[PDB]
Amino acid sequence: KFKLVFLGEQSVGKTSLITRFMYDSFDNTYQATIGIDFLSKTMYLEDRTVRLQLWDTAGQERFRSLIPSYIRDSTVAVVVYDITNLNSFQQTSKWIDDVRTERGSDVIIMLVGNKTDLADKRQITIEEGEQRAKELSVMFIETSAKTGYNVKQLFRRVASALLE
Numbered sequence: 484k485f486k487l488v489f490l491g492e493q494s495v496g497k498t499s500l501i502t503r504f505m506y507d508s509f510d511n512t513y514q515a516t517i518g519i520d521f522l523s524k525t526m527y528l529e530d531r532t533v534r535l536q537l538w539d540t541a542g543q544e545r546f547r548s549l550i551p552s553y554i555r556d557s558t559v560a561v562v563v564y565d566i567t568n569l570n571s572f573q574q575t576s577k578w579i580d581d582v583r584t585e586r587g588s589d590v591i592i593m594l595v596g597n598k599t600d601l602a603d604k605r606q607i608t609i610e611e612g613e614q615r616a617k618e619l620s621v622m623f624i625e626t627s628a629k630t631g632y633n634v635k636q637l638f639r640r641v642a643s644a645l646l647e
């Protein structure tokens with residue numbers, strides 16, 4: 484049950500993160516997700532292999548009613564925000580709240596501050612994200628689907644958490 488569901492407001496980088504991990508590519512052009520896609524891939528870690536299942540959800544508000552079914556079903560929830568967007572960060576509380584209401588203590592949550600490459604328009608410090616994650620008892624990491632920074636680390640840490 485290495486099932487990961489990506490949650491987060493529109494345009495924070497959920498699809499880009501999944502695509503960077505899956506095919507190690509990045510398209511700077513925006514193409515909104517209008518359904519729910521799933522992919523899978525086998526990765527290596529801690530002297531073994533693990534089969535991951537990834538769910539990419541639509542962040543636009545008109546698709547929110549389609550998301551609960553996927554949360555109930557996943558063992559890991561990756562809540563993503565955009566470090567250049569204050570609202571996207573504030574909204575992570577809603578997503579984390581939703582996940583815990585549906586999964587309780589039986590879930591691994593990773594808070595992700597994406598788009599670190601956009602340093603000049605950063606609105607949330609890495610320390611504020613790390614502090615929020617600690618206060619809410621969830622994992623934390625910053626990434627850049629564009630440069631690929633920490634993308635493999637994100638999945639490695641989530642997979643490691645599952646194994647433990």
Ligand SMILES: Nc1nc2c(ncn2[C@@H]2O[C@H](COP(=O)(O)OP(=O)(O)OP(O)(O)=S)[C@@H](O)[C@H]2O)c(=O)[nH]1
Nearest residue numbers: 494495496497498499511513516542598627628629
């Ligand atoms: N500069 C930069 N742009 C990024 C990064 N990750 C994603 N993007 C860009 O941000 C835009 C939105 O990314 P995308 O992956 O579509 O968001 P999403 O969360 O999947 O959005 P949705 O499908 O719920 S509406 C795209 O134009 C994409 O190329 C990043 O790490 N750095």
Ligand SMILES: [Mg+2]
Nearest residue numbers: 497498515516
């Ligand atoms: Mg998308």
